[model samples]
Target chain A: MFSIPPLPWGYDGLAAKGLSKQQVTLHYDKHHQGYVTKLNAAAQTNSALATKSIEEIIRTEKGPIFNLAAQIFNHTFYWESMCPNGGGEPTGKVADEINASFGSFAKFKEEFTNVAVGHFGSGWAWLVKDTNSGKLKVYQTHDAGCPLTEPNLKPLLTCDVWEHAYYVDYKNDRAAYVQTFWNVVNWKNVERQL
Target chain B: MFSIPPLPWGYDGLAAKGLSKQQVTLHYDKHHQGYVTKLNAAAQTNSALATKSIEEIIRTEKGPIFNLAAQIFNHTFYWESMCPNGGGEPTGKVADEINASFGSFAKFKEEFTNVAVGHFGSGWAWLVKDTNSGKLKVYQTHDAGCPLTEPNLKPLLTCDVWEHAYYVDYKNDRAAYVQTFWNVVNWKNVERQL
Candidate 1:
C-alpha cells in the first residue's frame, strides 16, 4: 500500500553542466532506478517487509532487503539533495548552526571536506543537521548509509564521495574533485530539506 | 644495478581524460613523483641507498626513507599497470598461472573484486605473485600500505580501490565500477609483470 515519491527535482534535469546528459540520465534511470526496483522486488517477496515504510524497511529487515532498501533511499535523497549550482556559503539557521558547532564556515568546510576526501572507499560525505543540539555537523558513511538511521541526526546537504561520483572527471585528484563539487551543490534544495 | 623505469606504455598521458586531471597530475608529477624525487634525494644523501637497487633498498631500510621509496616504487608501478583501454581477460602464461593457483580466472576475479570492494575504508586491491608458489593471488591493503613491505609477497596488477580512484565514477556501486574496470585493464603490462 506504499508508493515511493518522485525526486523533488525533475528527471533528465542536470546535476551540473559538467555531467553529460548521458551520465546523469543513466545515474538516475539505470543506477538509482535499479536500486528502487531491487528494493521493491525484495520487499514484494517478503510480505513482512511490504508492510513497513521505506525507512522502517531499511531499519528492521534482517538481510538483503535492508541493504537494497537502504541503497534506494540513500541514492534517492542524494540526487535531489544536490543541484548543479548547489554549493556556496551557507545561510540563515544552517550557517549559524554550523559555525556554532564547528567554529567557522571555513573550518566546517575543512572538516567536511576532509571527511569526504579521507574516506577510503565506498562511502558518502554528509553535512547533517544534528537535532540533539540543534546544530550542524559532518559525517562519513560506508556503503548504503544516511543520517536518517541515526536518531537525533538530520541531514541538510550531502556529497556522494564514492568513486563513481567523480572518477571519470577527477581520476586520482580527489582534492580537486571536492573543490569542484561545491559548484554543483543545490543549497536551495538543501534549504528546502531543512 | 637497477634503474626505475618509466610507465611501460606511457599511459601517464591519460590524465587528460581523468576527472581530477590537475590534482592527479600534481599527485603524480609532484606528490608521487616527489616521492621518487625525495626517495632518490634521500638516497643521494645516503650513499648506501644510492648504491642499491629499489628492491634492495626496500629490503634493508626500516624508516621514513624506506616508506617513501617503497611508495614511490609502488605508485609508479601501479599507474603503469593500468591503462584507459586496459581491462578484460588475461592472456598468456599469466592466465594459465591464475587458473592453476586460484582454480580459475573467474575465481581469481571474484576474490580480487570482493577484496577490493570489501576493504572497509581506504585501501588497495592487488594481484600479487606469491613468492612461495610463484602463484597469482589477490589481496587488499588499507591506507598507504604495500604488500611488498609485508614480507614474502610480490605485487603484480593492482587497483587503487581507495575512494580517490573510483569515487568519481562509482559512488558505492563498487561492484559495477569494479566490473567496468575490466574494460580498462592493461593486461599487456600485467603479463609483463608476471
Candidate 2:
C-alpha cells in the first residue's frame, strides 16, 4: 500500500563512475525490480496493508510481507545512496552532525569501519540520524535491516554489509571493501536525508 | 544424535601456519566451546535429549534443544574442519572420486567455486559424497548446513561460506577467498570422514 513512487534519479551516477552500464542496469532493473515484483505480489493479498505507507507497512507487519517490501526499499535507497564521485568528505549539516556525535572525521571513519568490518555475519552497518540532538549515530542490522522501526531515529545513510554488495569488487577482503565505500559515498544524498 | 566431534586431530597443523593463532585459538576455545556448552545445557532440560548424541538429537526432537544441539555440533565441525596447509591438493580416494564425477580437475574446481562463491547468504559450501554412487558432489547450505540431512550422502570436505569464516581475512573478494580455502583445505581429514 505504501510503495514510494520510484525515484527520478537515473543510474547515471553509478554508470559515470566506471561500473559498466549493464551492471548498473541489471542491478536496478533485474534485482531491484525483483523486489518490487515480490513486494507487490505479497502486499496485494493483504487488504489491510494497502492503506499504509511503506514506512507504515514496515511498522505494522513483522513477518513476510514486511521482509519483502523492506528489502525492496532498502536496496533502492542503497543504490541511489552512492555515486562515482560521491565519497571523500561530507560537508554542511551532515558533516557537522558526524563530527558532533563521533568526534572527528577520522574518528567517525574508525567507528564506522569497526561496525561494518567487524560485524560477525551477513548484515548491514548504518550511519543514521538521531533527531534529538540532530547528530549521527551508527548501528548494524541482520539480513534486510532498516532503521525505520527504531523510535525517532532517522536513517541518513547506510552501507550494505551483505556479500552481494561487494563480492564482485572486493570478494573476501571486507576491510578494503569498507575503505572503498568511504571513497565513493554519495554525501549529497545523505545531506538531503539529514 | 551423531554430530561430528571436534577435530580428533591436533591443532599442530593449525598452529604451524602463521595464521591468526590467537584468534583461532580463542575462536575454538570460547566460540565453539560455547555452542557445545549451550547445547548440553538445552539437552539437560529433557531426559530423552540428554541420552541422545548430536546426530540423534538432530534426527528427532523438532524443538529448540534439537536446533541448538545441532548448531553446537555443526559449528564445531565447521570450524576445526580447516587448517593452514589445507586445500592444496586432493589425493587417494577423494581425488579418484572427484575425477570420476566431474571428469577433470578443472571441472571440479569450477563447480566447487560456483557453489562456494555463489551461495547467497551465511552458509557452507561442501564437497560431499553421494552415497548411491559413492561419488563426489558439490552442495551449498544456507545456514547451519549439513550433508547428513540429505539421504545417503556423506560430506567429504566443506568450506564455511559464513561471513565469520573469511570476512576477517578476505573481506568482499570471495574468489580470492575460494582460492585461499583451496590452499588450506585438510584433505586427509576429508578422506577420513569419507
Candidate 3:
C-alpha cells in the first residue's frame, strides 16, 4: 500500500499566511490522502504495480496509476514546500543561483508569478535546477505533470496552481494566492534541494 | 470588444439544489467574467484577432489567445447548462436519443458520473454527438479545450470539473458536486442542443 504522508506542518500552520485551517485540512487530509488511497487501490488490482516504490511507479506508469501516484508525490512535495513563518528572500547558494539564472529575484518572481497565474487549468509552477545546464529556471506543468517526469529538471521548489490549492482561501483570485505563497514559501526546503 | 454573458439564472438560483449564492457569484462574476476580460485584453494587442468572433478565435488561434477565447465561450455555455428547477430525467428526443446511444438514461448517467468524477484535473465532461455516427458519447477535455475544436463532435451538454467550479461549494468533493449537477441539469438546454 502507498501510505499517505503526514503534513510537515500542523493543519493550521498556514492560516497566518492565507490558507484557513479548514482549507489546509481539506487539502491535506482529504485531497492529498485521497490520492494515496486511490493509488493503493489501483496497485492492489495489479500485483505487478504493488511491488514498486512510488517513484518507480511514477517513472514508468501511465493513465490512472500515474495520475494517482504523481498526485500523491506532488502533494507531499507541496506540503514541504512551505513552513509556518516561511517566505521572503533566500540567503545562500539558492539566492546566488536565482540571481545567476534569472538575472535577479524580481525577474524570477515575475516569471514564476506569470506562469502560476496564467496557467489555464490545474497545474504547478516550479523553480527547478536543470541538470544538463547546471542552471536554475522557472517551469510549469499541467494537471498531474511533475518535474520528475523530465530527467533534466531537478525540482527546487513548487507552488501548486491547481484551484484546490487556493480556491478555499483565495477563491478565483489565483494571483492573490500566488502572492501569499511567496510570503510563506519554505526557502529552507528549496535551498536544500539546490 | 467581447462581453461576458449574464447568468441564465440568478446567483442564488442553484442554492436550493446545493450550490450557494457565494459559489455562483465567484464562479460567474469572477472566474467566468475574468476569462472575457483577459480575452479582450489579449485581442487589443492583435488587431486581426480583435475582428474575429469568439468561436473563430477559438478555431484559428493558439496559446493564450486560444485559451482565453475558448474559456470565454465554455464559461458562457456552462452557465446556460443548468437551471433552478432542472434535473430528474429528460423528455422528448433528448431522452430517446440518450437511451439509443447509451442503452438508457441510467447508463448515460453512470458514464457521465464516472467520467466527471474520475477526471484527474481541471477539465469538462461532455455529452457530445458524433456527427458521422450520430451517436451521443461521453467526452472530456483538459483546461480550455472545447468540443468546438473537434469538427465532428457537437457538444450537447457539459459538466465543468474545474476545481474552482466546485471548491467553494463542495470543497474536495467532486463526486458530490457532480451529483448536485445531475440534480439541477437544464434538460431543456441539452434537448435544444440535440
Candidate 4:
C-alpha cells in the first residue's frame, strides 16, 4: 500500500524559520497523512493500481487515483526540501547549474519567487533540471500536477503554493511565506538531486 | 476601488453552527479581505481595468486580474449564503425549482454534497439556475472559477470548498464540514435569488 514517508525533521522543526509547530503538525499529520490514507483506500478497490509504484500510478492513473498518488509524492518531497537551519544559497553543482542557467542565484530567486507568489490557486512552484539539456528552469503546476509526468524535467526542488501549505502560519500573505521559505530551504537536499 | 463587503451576520455569527469564531474571523478578515486588497492593487496599475466594475473585470480580464476579481465576488457571495439559524429545506420558488429540476430536495442535497466533497482542490460547489433552461442544477468550479463566467448559469447559493473555508474548524475532515454546512445554509438567501 502507498504510505506517507517520515518527515526529515520533527513536526516542530520548522517553527524557528517562521512555520509554526501547529502548522507543521496539521499539515503533516492531517493533510499529508490524509493523502496516504486515501491512496491506500483507493488502491484497495482498483486491483491493477495496487501493484504499481507511486510514480507509476502518478504517470498512468487518471482522476482521483492520480490526484492522491501525486499528492503523496509531493508532500514527501516538500518535507525534505526544508530543514531546521535550511535556506540561504547553494554552494555545489546545484549552485553552478543555477548560475549557468539563470545567470545568478539572485536572478533565480527572483524568478522562483515570482512564480510561487503569482500562482493563482492550489499548486506548486518548482526549480527543475531539464535532463535533455542539463539546464535548470522555474516551473509551476496546478493541483496534483507532478513534474515526473514530463519526460525532460527532473525536479530539483519545490515549494508548495497550495493555500494549506501557508494559510495557517502566513494567512493570506503568500509572498511573506515564500520569502520565509528562502530562509529555511534545504540547499543540501537540492544539491543531492543533481 | 474594490472593497470586501462585511460578513452578513458578523464574525462570530456562524460559531453556533460548527464553524468557529476564529475560523470565521480569519476567513473574513484575512483570506476574503485579502482578495479585495489584491484586486484593488491590480486595478491601480491598469487604467482601463480601474474603470470596470468587479463583474466586468471578471468577465473581460484574462489572468491575475480575473482571478482576484472572481475570488472577491465569490467570497462575498459565500458570506451571504449562510446565517445563524438558516439550515433546513428551502421554501417558496427555490424549493419548487429544486424539486422540479432535481426531483426533490433530498436528491439535490445528495448531488450537492457529492460535488462539494468530491471537488479536487480550491473551488466552490454551487446551486445555480440555468438562465437558458430555467432549471436549477448543481455545479462545481475550480480555484477562482465563478459561476458568473458561464453565460447560462446564475448562482443561487454556494459552498466554499477551499481548504481555508473549513480547515481551522474541521481540519482535514471536509466531509464533516460539508455536513455542518447544511445546518447553516441560508435558504432565504437562496430563495431570493429565484
Candidate 5:
C-alpha cells in the first residue's frame, strides 16, 4: 500500500508564487491525502492491489483503483513540477529540446498554457517526451489520467487543471492560475526528468 | 441565441440554506453564464446549431455542443431544485410515490445523499422517473450530463456536486454541501416534476 509523499516544500512555500497557504494546505492535506487514504483502504481488502507498486497499479488497473493510483502519481508529479521560486523557462538540455521541438520557449509556454486553460472539467496538462522520436510534446489527460499509462512517452512536467487545484486561489479564473503556475514551474526538475 | 435563465432567487437568497452569496453568484454568473456565452459564441458560427433548440441539441449532439447544451439544462434545473427555506420530506402525491418507490422518505434521502457525496469529479446526482417502469430512481450524470439523454427517463431533481458548485462555500467538503443542500431542496418543485 502507498502513502502520500511529503510535500516537497512547506504548505506556505508557494505563497510568494500566488497560491495561498490555505489553498496548498487543503489540496495536499485533503485532496491528495484523500487519494492515499482511499487507496490504502481499498488495498486492505484486495490482496492483489496490496502487492503491486504504484506504477504497476496505474498501468494495470482500471476504474476505481486506477483512478486512485494515477491521481497519486499525477499529484506527486504536479508538486515536484514546481518549487518555492520556480518557473520562467527550461534550461540546459531541456531548453535544447524545447527549441528543437517547439521552436522557442514562448511558443511552448503559449501552447501549454492554452491546453491547461481550456481543458474541460477535471484534468491535467503536461510536457512529455516521446521515446521513439525523442521529441517533446504538450500532453493533456482527463480525470485521474497519467502519462505512465502510455508506454511510448515519459512525463517531464505537469500543471493540475482540476478546479480544486486553483479554485481557492483564483476562483473560476483558470487562465490566471495557469499564468501564475508558469512563475513557479521547476524548470530544473523538468530538465532532470528529460 | 440562448441566454442563462434567471436564477429562481436572488444571489443571497440561499444564504440561510448554507450556500453564500459569493458561492451562488459565481455559480450563476461566472460558471453558468460562461456556458451560455460559450454556447452562443459557437452557435454564431455554426448555422445548424443556431437553428436547433437547446433540448434538441442536447439529445442529438456530441462533444462540445452537447457538453454546453446539457450543462445549461442541468444548471437551470439545479437552481429550481432548491429554495430559500426548502428541503426535508416530500408531501402529497410526491410523498406517496417516494414511499412506494424507495420504501420510505428516509430511504430515498439516504440513497440520494450517498450518490451526491460519493460522485467523483464534475458531475450531478439526480432523482429521475423511468417512464417505462413508471418508477422513481436515483441518477447520476458526469460533466455536463443530464437525465434527458436517457430516452425513457424524466429528471425530477438534481444536486450539483461539481467542485465549482460548492468549492467556495464548502471547499473540498462536498458532503457538507450536500447536507446543507437538503435543507434547501424545493419539495414543491420536486412534486411538480413528478
Candidate 6:
C-alpha cells in the first residue's frame, strides 16, 4: 500500500559535503527502500493499518507497524533535511530562536553533534521545537523513534546517526560524519518547521 | 582498565567467505575498540566496575557501563566465533544436540538465519543452552545485549547482525551477510561452548 519516497536530489547531490553518490544511493535505494518493502508486506495482514496514515500508524501502533511507518517518515524527513548547497547558520526566524534557545548557532551545532555522535546505536538526533514552550530543543530518538510521536514537539532538522548512514564514507568515525552533516543541512526546511 | 582484544586471525581471514579485510578491520579496529575505550574510561570513575570482569559488569550494571562492558564481551566473542575455514554443520556432541534440539541442523540454520535477518536494528542472534532443560534455544538480543546476562542460559554461538557488521561488503543486504556468515562460522568454538 505504501512506497519509498523519491530522494529530493540526485544521488550525487551531497557529494561535495562528504556523502558520496554511492553512500546516498545505498542508504536511500537499499536501506530506506527496504523499510517500504517490509512495511507493505506487513500491512497486507491488517486492513486498518494498510489504510491508516503513516503518521497515524506511527503514533498509535507498536511492533513492526510502528517501526516501519515511523522509519518511512524519519527517512523522508532526513532527505528533506539536506541539500547540495545547504547548512551555515540559519538566517530567518529559525536562526533567532536557535540563538535565543541555545545561546548561539555554534552552541546548538555542538550540542547536536554531541548527541548525534554519542547516541549508542541506530537512532536519530533532532532539532525540535517545543510546542508548549515555543523554544528550540535538541532531542534524540532510538531505533525508529521520531519526534512525531511526541505531541509537544515539532521536528525541525534531523541527523541520522545509524552506523549505516556513514559507514561508507566515514567508517566508524561518527563524529566526523556528524560534523560533515552540518555542511549539507537544509536550514530552509528547518526554518519551515519552526 | 580494558582494551580491544586481538583478532583471532588476520583481517583477510574471512575474505574467501565474503567478509572483506576492510570490513573486518573497521569493525574490529574502530567500532569494537571504541567500546573498549569507552568502557575503560567509564571504569576509571567507578572502582568496582574497574575490578569486575566484563561478564560480571554486564550482569550487574545498566546504562552506559553495561552497554560498554557487554559490547566488549560480545565483540570479543564475535571475533572468536569465526575462522578462516569454518561453517557447514556441527560435529560430535554439539552436532548431536543440533539434531536433538531443533530436529536437524538444517532447521536450526533456517531458524537462526530468520532470527538474524529479521531482527530489527542492531542486535545479535544466538544459539544457546537453557540451563533448566539443557536443551538448545535460538535467541535474539538488542544492541549490546548478551546471553551472559541471563543466568539460566549458556551462549553456544552468535551472529552479529548490526549493519556495520556487513555494510562494507553487503551494504543493506543483511540476509546475504548472514548467509555468508554460515560459511565462516567457527563450528569448533561453538561446540566448545556446548
Per-candidate interface C-alpha RMSD?
Answer: 5.5, 7.6, 0.8, 1.6, 0.7, 0.8
Error of 3 at B51 (Å): 2.3
By TM-score, how accurate is candidate 1? 0.63
State the lDDT of candidate 4 residue by residue for A55-158, as single tens digits.
Answer: 99888888889998898888888888999888889887888889999999999999999999988878999999999998999999999899999969988889
> Taking the tens digit of each residue's C-alpha lDDT, what string does model 1 give over B1-194?
23455654453444433424443444456446656766777766777777776667677787666666666676777777767766678878888888899998788888988887766545678888878778777877755567877767888877776554544435556676567566667788788877
> Which residue pairs clash in candidate 4?
A87-A185
Tell how far residue A10 is off in model 4, in angstroms. Answer: 2.2
lDDT of each residue in B47-80, candidate 3, tens digit only: 7877899899888888888988888888888878
Chain A alone, TM-score per model: 0.86, 0.85, 0.98, 0.98, 0.98, 0.97
lDDT of 2 by residue, A1-194 (tens): 33444534465545444444544555566556766776677667877766776767777788667776677767767766777768788888877878889888889988889999866556778888878776688888777666888867887777777755654444455687787778778888888887
The lDDT, on a scale of 0 to 1, for candidate 3 is 0.88
Which of the two, 4 or 6, has more DockQ? 6
The best candidate by lDDT is 5
The second chain of candidate 1 has a TM-score of: 0.76
Q: Cα deviation in Å at residue B23, candidate 2?
A: 26
Every model's TM-score: 0.63, 0.54, 0.96, 0.95, 0.97, 0.96
Report model 2's TM-score to 2 decimal places: 0.54
What value does the interface RMSD of model 1 take?
A: 5.5
If both were scored by lDDT, which would come out higher, candidate 4 or candidate 5? 5
Question: How do all the candidates rank in terms of TM-score, highest first?
Answer: 5, 3, 6, 4, 1, 2
RMSD of 1: 6.7
The superposed Cα distance between candidate 4 and the true structure at residue A9, in angstroms, equals: 1.6
User: Which docking category, incorrect, acceptable, medium or high, applies to candidate 2?
Assistant: incorrect
Candidate 3 on A1-194: residue-level lDDT in tens?
67976778889888988888988998888888888888778777899998898889879999878888888888888888999878898878888999999999999999999999988788988889999999999999878898888979998888888888888888888899999999989999998898
Given candidate 6, what's the lDDT at residue B162?
Answer: 88
Q: In model 1, which regions exceed 4 Å deviation?
A: A1-7, A11-20, A37-54, A57-68, A84-90, A103-106, A117-119, A168-194, B1-4, B12-75, B79-100, B104-125, B129-136, B140-146, B149-152, B159-194
DockQ scores of all models, one per candidate = 0.29, 0.10, 0.91, 0.63, 0.83, 0.79
Spell out the clash pairs found in candidate 6. Answer: none
